[PDB]
Structure formats: structure tokens, C-alpha cells
Symmetry: C2
Subunit: 316 residues, 2 copies
């Protein structure tokens, strides 16, 4: 009436009496979803426990910690013990919200955190965490499926630029297949991944695919023509380097190559003359440009490669 | 010495003009720098071609007789344990299947002409575990299955951002349902029984309403004094409203009539109209009073957004 209104976490309020009740305590009153909750406290700062009973005898309990640091709102069945739902909120605005099945086991949990991530945990009919969806401030979304052991079955991540990664795990919990889709549509496919991190690799480009291997430290894709093998290495971070070897032992015909990481360019030499620049562009394309017979100036214009056979031709 | 034919999945096959010693045509194709070769009784480009990788992995391209479909299989060196299988139609629709180390299907990804796609994950015993489906109408569906191949949960997001979350019990029966409308209002159904009954709550801007669910309808109630206002929602989402008052006196008892065409409840006391409550398409309620004699509406309709305001209207 002249009761004191106290502001709480998660936007709630409680009224605290100025006078004692029959039991020598302060009366607390709050309203939540139209149910008036009431409780008593030794303290008048707004902390304490308040309870209400719905028409169906469901019991609602609001617990406000002694220092106003958190509030918990529980809805129980008529037994006063089997949870229907629980919401816990901090002043820092983070909250958890839990729903339960008819057994009182989890059906759903939502967590919003200080870092502005939001997690949705979905449970199966037996109350086992089976699926998790998480949004983060960097605008990524992650989807995770869990099996009976509570270990990851698959994990799918999308980013705001529409690139994505998919990881699949075997029954030992180990990564067994991975599929990366870049923002530009090109892709990396890793198949038959082993416990030591090794597996088969393919880079799917516009017009052609480059195949090779994955190890812990690196992806290496190879193109072979005659005795020449070109290798495109991709680091874990996505950094591309390229190298060439020719097992031809004849000096007039053996290809060698130099890599300029600053310009992402491989320069091929035959018989002490620079012959071509292969540029590995930021578009995940390859261009080829010839040098003059002097081996010092590039001629014409660089040409975008469209097919594997054109890479092979450049290696001849 | 051969003719070139174009295939689904951006492939090509070369067919010989002459026959081989077995009286068939020779076929050659290059797929990702592996040359595949095969033979066929036909010369249109249909048939089976195979190649062997450095590690003796086997790749098999099967082109259907009508040229409308291609199958590209990758096997382990036994030539029978699958690694992957991609089927592409003339449509550009495709399926991609990825197998585990035993040669058993682990997942399948299907891209349709409809434009939609479907992802299916299979568990250790070969049963469907999880499915994700996206449609041209831009909705997405997420399904988890139990041991019996029945749903454990189903989540649906629509293009207008509405959503549905369904949970099923051990008997495969619907046990909870949560609906979020595009405007953010929600319906929450809890404790659902085998007959479709349960508890209901509607979460509105400013207030909640609670009630019951039957197979017939959802009935949400607000009580004030001897008056009970019941807001009914059919399974089609149509709202209809009724009022009862246990006050027996002619002078004070509230009665009401419902006009579905205008979504309006008109309240009467002592043979005079007192107020119109309108249940709007935005899931709101407005109230407007009649003049001193109950003859015509006065003032303007007012949107009410607190439960106590609804109860005031019932006084």
C-alpha cells in the first residue's frame, strides 16, 4: 500500500511490507503471469521466497537470492516437487530456461550468455541431450547432433558469409569425414579420415577438381603430367603454397619452379629460362601467363584455367 | 576413331566406331583425371566404366540406357565396399551417399529440382536417426527419430519466422507443442494426453491467458467476480469468444453475443449494450463503450494490454 517496490533481475518487481506479519516477518508480494505470489522474509531488501498455487494446484515458486544477484522461477506439478519449468536470471542479463517432461526430466534448455551467444538444447523422449543449436555474436550458427554416449555425431556450422563446415564423427568419437563449402562455392571434401588425422582430399573448383591427401599438418593436392608433379598445399588456416618436382634428369627438359607467397605465383623454369607464371588467385582460380623467349617479360595476358587438362598442358 | 557424348553431372564419354573382340563397343571417360573404361552393346554412351586409383580404390561410372541418369561410385580396393555414391539426373537433381568404414550408409543428401533439399543421418544399426528438410516455400524441418522409427521431436521454422516445436513421449504420442507466431505471440500446450487434451497457455503482448486443450478446441479463460470470459481457438486458429455470469439478477447479470464476421463480443447488462470487445487479427483486444442507453458506440476503441484491463471490462 505504502509497501516498498524493489526492482529485481529479469525485469521483475517485488513489494515489501513496512509492517510485520503474524509470524514476525516482512510480507513479500509479486505477480508473475497473473498469479499473485506471496512469501515472508526476515529481510526487507526484496530477497526471499514467494509461492503461489494455480487453479490446477500447480505450485509456482520465485526465489530471490539474498543479495538480489539472481532470481529463480520454478513451476512444479501439484506435488510441489516435479518440475515443469525453471527460469534462472542474473542482473547481467544472462538467463537459463528449462522445460521438463512428464517425468520431471529435461525436454528443453535455453541459455543466453554474457558473450551474447544463445544456446538451445533439445532432448529426446528419454531426457537425453540430442541436439544443440547455438547462435553467436559473429553471426555463426552451429548445429550439433549427440548420440547416446553424449558425444558428437555431427557438427554443422554456417557463417554470415554463407560458407559452412560439416564434421562427421564415427562411433569412437573421431572425425571421419569433413566437407567445407567456401563463401565462393568452391569446396574441400575429406573422406576416410583416420585416427591419426590422415585421409583423402579433394578441392572442388569451378571446372575441375584437384585430388590428394590430408595429414595433420596440411592438405596437399597433386596434378601429374609426364614426370612432373605439381603440389598445392593448404594449411589449416587456408594459406595456399605451391611446389613442383620433375623426376626428369635431362637438363634441357627438366621443369623446376619457384613460389612467391607474397604474389601467390609459381614461376616455372626450363633450361635456365622462365617459361610461365601460374597465379593462384583469391577467387580460388588459377591463371597462366607465358614469358617471352628471353625469359624476362611476361607476354600477352594471363589466362584463367578452366579444366584439369589445361593445368596438365602447363606442366608439359 | 570414337564419338563424344555429353552426360548428366557435366561428364562426357567417348564411344568407339568399331567393335572389340567381344563384339561390343568401347567406352572411355575421364572423371577427375582418372581414365575410366568399359564396354557396351549400345553405342549411345550408356553403360558401365571403371578405373583404378594408385591405391587400388575403384571408381565406377554407370550411365543409364536412356542417358538420363549417371551413378558415380567410389569403392575400397575390394571393389565392393562403398565409400561414396553420387546419382545425378538429367534434372540436375542428385543424391549423395556417404558410407562408413564398414560400407554401411551413414548419411544421404538429396537436392531436388523442387529446389529443396533433404539430409538424412543413419545410426550404427542402419536406422534413420535425424532428418533436415528445406523447401521452396523456405520452411525448414528438423526431425529426430527413436528406436521404433517414430518421431522424438520435430521443429519447424517458416519463411515468416513462425515456428512449431513438437515433442513426443515414449509411446510416440504428442506430449508438448509450442507455437510461436510471426508477431511473437505464442501458444504452449503441455501435458498432452492420448486423446489430444492437455493444458494451454497463450502468451500475448502484455499478458498471458491460460486454459485447456481438447481435440475440439483450445479454451482460455479470464475470471472476474461471477463472470467467466472464454476465448476459444479452433485447430484452424479461428478465435470465438463466449461469456457466462453466475449472477442471477436481471439488473446486474452480464450476457454476451459473438459476431464472428467482426470478431466482436458485445456485452449486455439489464437489456442494454455496455461494451464491444474486439479480438483483432494482431492478437490484441480492444474495448469500446456504448452510450448511456446502450444505443450506439461512444468514443474510440482502446487497445487493452494488461490482464487487469480485461478484468475491468468484465466488472
Amino acid at each position: 500500500k505504502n509497501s516498498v517496490s524493489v526492482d529485481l533481475p529479469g525485469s521483475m518487481k517485488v513489494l515489501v511490507s513496512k509492517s510485520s506479519n503474524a509470524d514476525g516477518k516482512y510480507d513479500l508480494i509479486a505477480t508473475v503471469d497473473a498469479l499473485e505470489l506471496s512469501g515472508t522474509s526476515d529481510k526487507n531488501n526484496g530477497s526471499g521466497v514467494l509461492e503461489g498455487v494455480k487453479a490446477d494446484a500447480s505450485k509456482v515458486k520465485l526465489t530471490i537470492s539474498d543479495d538480489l544477484g539472481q532470481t529463480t522461477l520454478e513451476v512444479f506439478k501439484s506435488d510441489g516437487s516435479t518440475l515443469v519449468s525453471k527460469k534462472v536470471t542474473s542482473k547481467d542479463k544472462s538467463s537459463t530456461y528449462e522445460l521438463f517432461n512428464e517425468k520431471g526430466e529435461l525436454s528443453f534448455k535455453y541459455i543466453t550468455r554474457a558473450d551474447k551467444s544463445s544456446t538451445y538444447e533439445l532432448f529426446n523422449e528419454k531426457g537425453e541431450l540430442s541436439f544443440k543449436y547455438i547462435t553467436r555474436a559473429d553471426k555463426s550458427s552451429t548445429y550439433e547432433l549427440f548420440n547416446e554416449k553424449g558425444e558428437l555425431s555431427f557438427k554443422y556450422i554456417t557463417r554470415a558469409d554463407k560458407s559452412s563446415t560439416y564434421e562427421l564423427f564415427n562411433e569412437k568419437g573421431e572425425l571421419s569425414f569433413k566437407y567445407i563449402t567456401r563463401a565462393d562455392g568452391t569446396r574441400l571434401e575429406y573422406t576416410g579420415i583416420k585416427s591419426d588425422g590422415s585421409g583423402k582430399a579433394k578441392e572442388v573448383l569451378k571446372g575441375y577438381v584437384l585430388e590428394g591427401t590430408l595429414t595433420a599438418e596440411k592438405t596437399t593436392l597433386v596434378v601429374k603430367e609426364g614426370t612432373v608433379t605439381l603440389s598445392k598445399n593448404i594449411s589449416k588456416s587456408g594459406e595456399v603454397s605451391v611446389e613442383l618436382n620433375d623426376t626428369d634428369s635431362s637438363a634441357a627438359t627438366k621443369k623446376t619452379a619457384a613460389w612467391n607467397s607474397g604474389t601467390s605465383t609459381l614461376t616455372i623454369t626450363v633450361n635456365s629460362k622462365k617459361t610461365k607464371d601460374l597465379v593462384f588467385t583469391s577467387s580460388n582460380t588459377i591463371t597462366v601467363q607465358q614469358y617471352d623467349s628471353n625469359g624476362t617479360s611476361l607476354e600477352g595476358s594471363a589466362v584463367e584455367i578452366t579444366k584439369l587438362d589445361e593445368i596438365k598442358n602447363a606442366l608439359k
